[PDB]
């Protein structure tokens, strides 16, 4: 079996969580890697942005990323990429003609890639599996246009792969999706890498990151974009220091795009530390160093960060949003906050900070909870999904 994955506007090779790269990229790369271990051949198609990479990047046996030239390597934001939809498709057409490569199935990611997938699937006469990741309908002409495209894929994809049951309901309510075409594919997290793991490990991580050993740490991990609510953490941390100015608390934000500006405007610069984004092998230390990972998203998911933090034995305080209530077991492995008021977040942070016995237990339980998430699981589900889709054409 050879699968063409389409990830047009962002590449699985781009460092997550700056820029346009986040959980979807790690989702695409992680599943693809697992599929490739299982002997399924995957090529991930993406728009060429870094020419030093070449056209074909060989990631592992059975796994390639294909960098397709379509418009300039830069100066084209995600909002303008619809203008490249036909060029990118044409780019994929030539590459496959040149390489004489044939696919059994296409799995598209995000509405841009789905529009490409929809054309390719009719041309190649093979099934299209589509994963939305996020959706307009969950108020401008641009969002209206995206919604319309998202509606087209709902109506035309052979299988709509969603990441939770809540997204399935979302598809059915906001897009009138046929429930027979929807399939829940639960996501994973790299649970071997993100792990507690060892009695001295938290403190080893603190030494490595230059964090004081006797202090409480809240971490935010991910893209620094308003929809992710890092401003909520910063504002809540300000409130905490209004209540008790010498609270033993340091914050790490880790993190690519000003939020430092907001932090100094609120007087909390010296207790907040902004870390550059780093590969998973290095992120572990942020998770382990942390007593609490705060994830104040306005929109989401699953919530890969919530899962990775859990896997690493660190309780999460999450917004009651997207996949987060499924990623976090409320009251057992963390807390869920309603809304994004600094006051409500201060409350939730304070209750986990000041109750050691509870917080420690959540962290230990978070590990047990997170082992239910299993990229290799995820791929096993996709593999079946692919086999059925192929069998029914």
Ligand X SMILES: O=c1ccn([C@@H]2O[C@H](COP(=O)(O)OP(=O)(O)O)[C@@H](O)[C@H]2O)c(=O)[nH]1
Binding residues for UDP-N-acetyl-alpha-D-glucosamine: 15-16, 23, 223, 228, 278, 300, 308
Distance CA 175, CA 171 (A): 5
The gap between the terminal CA atoms of the chain, to the nearest Å, is 15
Nearest distance from C-beta of residue 92 to Mg ion, angstroms: 43
- Give me the least distance between CB of 45 and a copy of itself, in Å please: 14
Please report which helix (H) or strand (E) contains residue 20, including its range.
Answer: none
Q: Which x/- pattern, by CB under 8 A, does the window 110-149 give for a copy of itself? A: -----xx-xx--xx-----------------xx-xxx-xx
DSSP code, position 300: -
Nearer of residues 230 and 363 to ligand X, judged by Cβ: 230
> Tokens at residue 372, please?
């239910």
Annotated binding site: 9, 15-16, 20-25, 78, 110, 134, 146, 223, 228, 278, 287-288, 290, 300, 308, 314
145 binds, among a copy of itself, Mg ion, ligand X, none (CB under 5 to 8 A by kind): a copy of itself
Interruption sites in the chain after residues (C→N beyond 2.5 Å): 138, 257
89 binds a copy of itself (CB under 8 A): yes
Q: How far is the CB of 182 from ligand X (least distance, A)?
A: 20
Give the helix/strand (H/E) hosting 186: none
Q: Which does 314 bind (CB under 5 to 8 A by kind): a copy of itself, Mg ion, ligand X, none?
A: Mg ion
Q: What gap in Å lies between CA 302 and CA 24, rounded to an integer?
A: 10
Contacts with Mg ion in 238-297 (CB under 5 A)? 288, 290
Q: Of 264 and 354, which has the nearer Cβ to Mg ion? A: 354
For the CB of residue 221, give the shortest distance to ligand X in the complex, in Å: 5
| Residue 197 interaction partner, one of ligand X, Mg ion, a copy of itself, none, beta carbon < 5-8 Å per kind | none
In 3D, which of 73, 69, 161, 75 has the Cα closest to residue 114? Answer: 161
Tokens found for residue 283: 């992120």
Which of Mg ion, ligand X, a copy of itself, none binds 146 (CB below 5-8 Å, type-dependent)?
A: a copy of itself
Task: Kindly indicate which of the ranges 9-17, 24-32, 88-96, 308-316 contains the residues binding a copy of itself, using the contact rule CB under 8 A.
Answer: 88-96
Chain center to CA of 276? 17
3-class DSSP assignment, residue 66: strand
x-or-dash string of contact with a copy of itself, 42-71, rule CB under 8 A? -----------------------------x
CB contact at 8 A, 118 and 97: no
**Residues touching a copy of itself, count (CB under 8 A):** 31
Are the C-beta atoms of 373 and 326 separated by less than 8 Å?
no
**Is residue 314 a contact residue for Mg ion (CB under 5 A)?**
yes
C-beta closer to ligand X: residue 303 or 363: 303
Give the list of residues 6+ apart from residue 75 with CB closer than 8 angstroms, or none: none
Q: Rounded CA gap, 334 and 296, in Å?
A: 13
Q: Binding site for 1D-myo-inositol 3-phosphate: what residues are annotated?
A: 9, 20-25, 78, 110, 134, 146
Which spans of this chain sit near ligand X (rule: CB under 6 A)?
Answer: 16-17, 22-24, 26, 221-222, 254, 277-278, 280, 283, 301, 303-305, 308
Backbone angles phi, psi at 136, to 5 degrees: -50, -50
CA 278 to chain centre: 15
Q: Which of 147, 68, 142, 140 lies closest to 101 in space, CA to CA?
A: 68
Residues that bind Mg ion (CB under 5 A): 288, 290, 314
């Amino acid at each position: 079996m050879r699968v063409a994955m389409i990830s047009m506007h962002t590449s699985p090779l781009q460092q997550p969580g700056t820029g346009d790269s986040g959980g979807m990229n790690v989702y695409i790369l992680s599943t693809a890697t697992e599929l490739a271990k299982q002997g399924i051949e995957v090529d991930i198609y993406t728009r060429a942005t870094r020419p030093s990479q070449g056209e074909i990047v060989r990631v592992a046996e059975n796994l390639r990323v294909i960098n397709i030239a379509a418009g300039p390597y830069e100066g084209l934001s995600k909002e303008e990429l619809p203008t490249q939809l036909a060029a990118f498709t044409g780019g994929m057409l030539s590459f496959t003609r040149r390489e004489k490569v044939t696919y059994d199935l296409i799995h598209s990611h995000y509405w841009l890639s789905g529009q490409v997938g929809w054309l390719l699937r009719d041309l190649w006469r093979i099934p299209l599996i589509h994963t939305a990741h996020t959706l307009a309908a969950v108020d401008t002409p641009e969002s209206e246009a995206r919604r319309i495209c998202e509606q087209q894929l709902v109506d035309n994809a052979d299988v709509l792969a969603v990441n939770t049951q809540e997204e399935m309901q979302d598809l059915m309510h906001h897009y009138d999706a046929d429930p027979d075409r929807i399939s829940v594919v639960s996501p994973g997290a790299d649970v071997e890498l993100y792990s507690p793991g060892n009695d001295r490990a938290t403190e080893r991580s603190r030494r490595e990151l230059g964090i004081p050993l006797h202090t409480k740490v809240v971490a935010f991990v991910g893209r620094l974009q308003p929809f992710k609510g890092p401003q909520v953490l910063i504002k809540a941390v300000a409130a905490l220091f209004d209540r008790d100015p010498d609270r033993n608390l340091r914050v790490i934000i880790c993190g690519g795009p000003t939020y430092r500006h907001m932090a100094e405007e609120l007087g909390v610069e010296k207790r907040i530390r902004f870390l550059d984004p780093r590969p998973p092998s290095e992120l572990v230390a942020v998770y382990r160093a942390a007593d609490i990972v705060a994830v104040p998203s306005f929109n989401e998911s699953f919530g890969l960060v919530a899962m990775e933090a859990q896997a690493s034995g660190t309780p999460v305080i999450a917004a009651r949003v997207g996949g987060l209530p499924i990623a976090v077991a409320e009251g057992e492995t963390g807390l869920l906050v309603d809304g994004h008021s600094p006051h409500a977040w201060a409350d939730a942070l304070a209750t986990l900070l000041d109750d050691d016995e509870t917080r420690i237990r959540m962290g230990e339980d978070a590990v047990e909870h997170a082992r239910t998430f299993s990229w290799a699981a995820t791929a096993a589900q996709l593999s079946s999904l692919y086999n059925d889709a192929i069998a029914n054409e």
